[PDB]
Design a protein around this nucleic acid. Structure first.
Ligand SMILES: Nc1ncnc2c1ncn2[C@H]1C[C@H](O)[C@@H](COP(=O)(O)O)O1
Ligand SMILES: [Mn+2]
Ligand SMILES: [Mn+2]
Ligand SMILES: [Mn+2]
Ligand SMILES: [Mn+2]
Ligand SMILES: [Mn+2]
Ligand SMILES: [Mn+2]
Ligand code: NA
Length: 346
DNA sequence: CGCTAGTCGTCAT
DNA sequence: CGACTAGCG
């Protein structure tokens, strides 16, 4: 997620109701609902007791969408992306702590604080996701497990014209080049929409409303794939790309201190990591549900060698990718946990 | 002052 | 995933 991006481009946002997309197709970033839903039953999840409350939670949203003639496609995160591994480890660490300190507090009588710890330690498993998937399919709703981050899969579905809008809490989706994004959507259908075309409604951006420069700015502010330089956020990054008159981004980043009148030490690795992050936003693997095969989010340019792009996701055989996308294949064990055949979105 | 970095909350009785 | 804020320059 781009820290503070939603406030930074807030003038491009427009309150809406989802009936706006009646009779159209909308893809969902389902881990947002999953997380919110799992919080409601955190005690039982932390204690290992059985629960399916989070299923009902997600399902009231899905049913709400259906009541307004919306075709939802639930998308799920798949295998872990190397580019993101660090950030993920950090989350795990925090969760681990909040589990121990939680249990600790249960052995000190204090349950009020223990629950506040349990709510911050929930880990969303693939089994839980799959429960949501079965529940959804029982209502005729398509589900799709992304090969890697759902962000990219969603962006792809949007850019391909497969869906008209993405529902998510996550600002990243704009850096991936989503067309339309629906944030803050509640159980009634009220949300905030940001169109890519309307980023020019943000005077604060200047000419940084093109897809490329916007992406550069997001990376420079600090993202999941690369931490910012010391003291650089959206404002500074944006400013740098505004004053930037050179087309080559590397030389810009080498003169970033000059553009901001600061003494910024830029490590040589920061460049390669920037290239890495850029390439990850551009080329992260996704699954074409129509051709049923793995593809990068955008076609490889002449300036990128795909062999160097392992951090953006490893290729696997299309048949495996398909079984993962169907939610048939367990991400961890790669064993078959279900037998859904749609032949008897795809 | 604007801005970044780090801490706290998402559920729901 | 984000919102909020104390404190940084
Ligand atoms: N605490 C919390 N609240 C809301 N959304 C969250 C949270 N942690 C992660 N996420 C989002 C980030 C990803 O888009 C997705 C999977 O993250 P993963 O870490 O694999 O579960 O869920
Ligand atoms: Mn609760
Ligand atoms: Mn895989
Ligand atoms: Mn995500
Ligand atoms: Mn993201
Ligand atoms: Mn070219
Ligand atoms: Mn202040
Ligand atoms: Na930053």
């Amino acid at each position: 997620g781009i820290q503070g991006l939603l406030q930074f481009i807030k003038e491009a946002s427009e309150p809406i109701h989802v009936r706006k997309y009646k009779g159209q197709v909308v893809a969902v970033d389902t881990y947002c609902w999953l997380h919110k839903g799992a919080i409601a039953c955190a005690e039982k999840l932390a204690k290992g007791e059985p629960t399916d409350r989070y299923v009902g939670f997600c399902m009231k949203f899905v049913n709400m969408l259906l009541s307004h003639g919306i075709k939802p496609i639930l998308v799920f995160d798949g295998c872990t992306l190397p580019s993101k591994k660090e950030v993920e480890r950090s989350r795990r660490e925090r969760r681990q702590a909040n589990l121990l300190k939680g249990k600790q507090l249960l052995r000190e009588g204090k349950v009020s604080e223990a629950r506040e710890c349990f709510t911050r330690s929930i880990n969303i498993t693939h089994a839980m996701a799959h429960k949501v998937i079965k529940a959804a399919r029982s209502q005729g709703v398509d589900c799709l497990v992304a090969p890697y981050e759902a962000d990219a899969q969603l962006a792809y579905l949007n850019k391909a014209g497969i869906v008209q809008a993405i529902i998510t809490e996550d600002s990243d989706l704009l850096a991936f080049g989503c067309k339309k994004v629906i944030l803050k959507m509640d159980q009634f259908g009220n949300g905030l929409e940001i169109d890519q075309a309307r980023l020019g409604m943000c005077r604060q951006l200047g000419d940084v409303f093109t897809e490329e420069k916007f992406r550069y700015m997001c990376i420079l502010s600090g993202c999941a794939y690369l931490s910012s330089l010391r003291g650089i956020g959206l404002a500074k990054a944006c400013k740098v790309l505004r004053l930037a008159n050179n087309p080559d981004i590397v030389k810009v980043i080498k003169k970033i201190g000059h553009y901001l009148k600061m003494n910024i030490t830029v490590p040589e690795d920061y460049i390669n990591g920037f290239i890495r992050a850029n390439n990850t936003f551009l080329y992260q693997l996704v699954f074409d549900p129509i051709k049923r095969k793995l593809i990068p989010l955008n076609a490889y340019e002449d300036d990128v060698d795909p062999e160097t792009l392992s951090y953006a996701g490893q290729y696997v055989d299309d048949s495996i990718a398909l079984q993962i996308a169907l939610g048939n294949k367990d991400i961890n064990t790669f064993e078959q946990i279900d037998d859904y055949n749609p032949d008897t979105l795809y």
